[PDB]
Design a protein around this ligand. Structure first.
Ligand SMILES: *[C@@H]1O[C@H](CO)[C@@H](O)[C@H](O)[C@H]1NC(C)=O
Ligand SMILES: *[C@@H]1O[C@H](CO)[C@@H](O)[C@H](O)[C@H]1NC(C)=O
Ligand SMILES: *[C@@H]1O[C@H](CO)[C@@H](O)[C@H](O)[C@H]1NC(C)=O
Ligand SMILES: *[C@@H]1O[C@H](CO)[C@@H](O)[C@H](O)[C@H]1NC(C)=O
Ligand SMILES: *[C@@H]1O[C@H](CO)[C@@H](O)[C@H](O)[C@H]1NC(C)=O
Ligand SMILES: *[C@@H]1O[C@H](CO)[C@@H](O)[C@H](O)[C@H]1NC(C)=O
Ligand SMILES: *[C@@H]1O[C@H](CO)[C@@H](O)[C@H](O)[C@H]1NC(C)=O
Lengths: 49, 239, 299, 50
């Protein structure tokens, strides 16, 4: 039970925004220019780390 | 010719609609939205008064021979603001956001529109579709949020007289990008001609609540839990 | 990080199966959006009463703006302009008016000023574009054209996205006006435009386009052509702006006639519906995994 | 010119009825909330520029 719970929490943590416009990298890359995308990507990086 | 009598009754567990368009199968889902609280206090009208809109409206009716036909929404409803108008007849349904010079006691002549409004005005949006009103209980949920008027509906067979003790989820019916402000609404009736008639309907108001919904193997909502009703429901929502 | 290896098994890298091609599946609509009709109207409303139009169910092309005029200001906030030509939106709101040339700087989210607080206000989370181009040639009169008016006074502030049309005498004194002379003014003042006026005071036409996302299935996108449909292969897919990579197969899910997508317990997409042919497709990720190397010693 | 203001009741509606200011920018405090704050003392610097 504990192992399954920990894995489920880790997977579910991927839908959080961590104070960004979106939790999906694909649309961030497809609707923003490179100079402005990293400001959103780094927040996701920190949260997931 | 028209008599309106009021009463108060219990709502039990009714007025649950699909929150989004996402398919889910065999899962329990927590949602937060404007719902009708369980075992609430709904108003029973028996047979027009002008009622507030608040944040949303749950409407229920069980009349036969198509006595009730449509609703009107607005904020001043006389000459200064565009007003919604939903009209259901045998073949189709009209929806007009037009500005109407409403009569003092609007009604349907049955079929001239002079009994409802004297004339139209400067308006743009209009819509027409298959009739909404398709022994039988008809339930509707109306809500206006962020530039969108949303209507959910459900049709059920009933054998009793009061609210049935059962569960039914209201599937989405229509979404419109109208973008006006609504504060009051009223019911529209049709009188054959001035013969006296009778009708009955139930009204309730929505509030922000958190629910726990159950999806079966086929993507249909079959049960729900109101997380703020009592300690047991709070425990169920926590677990 | 060594030139010699001992006997054992080591985990080195990961393998993944690469995609083969790309799939684009848009709905079949050929109707063009009335961007041209909204422009070149030969008459634009005043700033205090700005014109609003709703655009939906059409194909949006942004090259018409490019060939329209050399815009003085062209600023997009939530979206890069160059990528506007391959996105999908639910509906578009176009607000058109005419202001002074130097007032263009006041049309921005989180901005204050006479226009930004008394005529038009944008939300803090605005997602759209602003275009402002000179109109000295067409909206100027030699004697002076006063058809355009702007509001100068208001009792309180203005929230984003509302329009005020009520006309009345604004009160400045403590006593009720019931007049015009004693400290009571008119909020609406007529613009004065002349050809001899220099840059910064000639009329400028301003159009604000407002978009939205995360709503009903998208309608305003058709500038790219669709392709065929393939199954049982690792491919890149794009269904109405929903993009991904994986393998599409036949599905046995009983979608009710109003859903589009499908999620699971972890809340990730696993089913989709083809817009042009109503059909349920299961989506599975392409194969990936780890690689281990088994070696004896290098001795 | 520099002036020190202290030991009084500060009302900011007089500025509102004064004139339609071309520029009115507050940095550390939102202007609308200026009417219910408490301060130790105020420094007013006045001049005229282009
Ligand atoms: C509903 O309200 C009425 C008075 O408005 C009150 O008497 C009654 O107890 C309430 N509850 C129910 C279930 O009727
Ligand atoms: C019912 O409504 C439709 C659409 O408004 C109209 O075409 C039709 O004539 C109406 N029928 C009657 C009997 O009023
Ligand atoms: C409707 O509104 C427009 C715009 O303000 C106005 O010009 C017109 O006089 C109004 N009435 C009618 C009947 O169009
Ligand atoms: C789901 O649909 C199947 C096929 O009609 C049916 O056999 C099954 O009973 C349904 N599930 C429930 C909970 O009724
Ligand atoms: C708009 O109208 C003007 C004059 O009627 C015309 O020259 C022009 O081609 C039209 N279209 C655009 C995109 O400007
Ligand atoms: C707004 O634009 C529409 C589009 O043609 C036009 O019919 C209408 O007269 C315009 N209104 C104003 C106030 O400019
Ligand atoms: C559009 O696509 C749908 C889905 O296959 C198809 O049924 C319809 O005939 C198509 N219509 C046109 C005009 O291409």
């Amino acid at each position: 039970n504990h192992n399954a719970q920990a894995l489920n929490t880790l997977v579910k943590q991927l839908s959080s925004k961590f104070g960004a416009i979106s939790s999906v990298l694909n649309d961030i890359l497809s609707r923003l220019d490179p100079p402005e995308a990293e400001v959103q990507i780094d927040r996701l990086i920190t949260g997931r780390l | 010719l028209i008599t309106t009598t009021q009463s108060y009754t219990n709502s039990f567990t009714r007025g649950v609609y699909y929150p989004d368009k996402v398919f889910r199968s065999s899962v329990l889902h927590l949602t937060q939205d404007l719902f009708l609280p369980f075992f609430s206090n709904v108003t029973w009208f028996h047979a027009n008064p002008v009622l507030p809109f608040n944040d949303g409206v749950y409407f229920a009716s069980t009349e036969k021979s198509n006595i009730i036909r449509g609703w009107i929404f607005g904020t001043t409803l006389d000459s200064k603001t565009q007003s919604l108008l939903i009209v259901n007849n045998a073949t189709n349904v009209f929806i007009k956001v037009c500005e109407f010079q409403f009569c003092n006691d609007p009604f349907l002549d049955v079929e001239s529109e002079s009994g409802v409004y004297s004339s139209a005005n400067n308006c743009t949006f209009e819509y027409v579709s298959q009739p909404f009103l398709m022994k039988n209980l008809r339930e509707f949920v109306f809500k206006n949020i962020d530039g969108y008027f949303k209507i959910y509906s459900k049709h059920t067979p009933i054998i009793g007289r009061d609210f049935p003790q059962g569960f039914s989820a209201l599937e989405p019916l229509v979404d419109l990008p109208i973008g006006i402000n609504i504060t009051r609404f009223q019911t529209l009736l049709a009188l054959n001609r001035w013969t006296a008639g009778a009708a009955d309907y139930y009204v309730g108001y929505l509030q922000p609540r958190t629910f726990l919904l159950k999806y079966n193997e086929n993507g249909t909502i079959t049960d729900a839990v109101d997380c703020a009703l009592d300690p047991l429901s709070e425990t169920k929502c926590t677990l | 990080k060594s030139f010699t290896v001992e006997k054992g098994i080591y985990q080195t890298s990961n393998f993944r199966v690469q995609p083969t091609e790309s799939i684009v599946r848009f709905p079949n609509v050929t109707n063009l959006c009335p961007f041209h009709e909204v422009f070149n109207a030969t008459r634009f409303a005043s700033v205090y009463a700005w014109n609003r139009t709703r655009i939906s169910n059409c194909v949006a092309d942004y090259s018409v703006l490019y060939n329209f005029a050399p815009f003085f200001a062209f600023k997009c906030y939530g979206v890069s302009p160059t990528k506007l030509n391959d996105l999908c939106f639910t509906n578009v709101y176009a607000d058109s008016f005419v202001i002074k040339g130097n007032e263009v700087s006041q049309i921005a989210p989180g901005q204050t000023g006479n226009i930004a607080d008394y005529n038009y206000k944008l939300p803090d989370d605005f997602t759209g574009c602003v275009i402002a181009w000179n109109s000295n040639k067409l909206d100027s009169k030699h004697s002076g054209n006063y058809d355009y008016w702007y509001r100068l006074f208001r009792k309180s502030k203005l929230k984003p996205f509302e329009r005020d049309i009520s006309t009345e005498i604004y009160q400045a004194g403590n006593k009720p006006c019931k007049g015009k002379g004693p400290n009571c003014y008119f909020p609406l003042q007529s613009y004065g435009f002349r050809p001899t006026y220099g840059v910064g005071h000639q009329p400028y036409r301003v159009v604000v386009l407002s978009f939205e996302l995360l709503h009903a299935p998208a309608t305003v996108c058709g500038p790219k052509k669709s392709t065929n449909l393939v199954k049982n292969k690792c491919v890149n897919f794009n269904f109405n702006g929903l993009t991904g990579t994986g393998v599409l197969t036949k599905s046995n899910k009983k979608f009710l006639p109003f859903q589009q997508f499908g999620r699971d317990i972890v809340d990730t997409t696993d089913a989709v519906r083809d817009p042009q042919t109503l059909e349920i497709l299961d989506i599975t990720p392409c194969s990936f995994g780890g690689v281990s190397v088994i070696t004896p010693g290098t001795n």
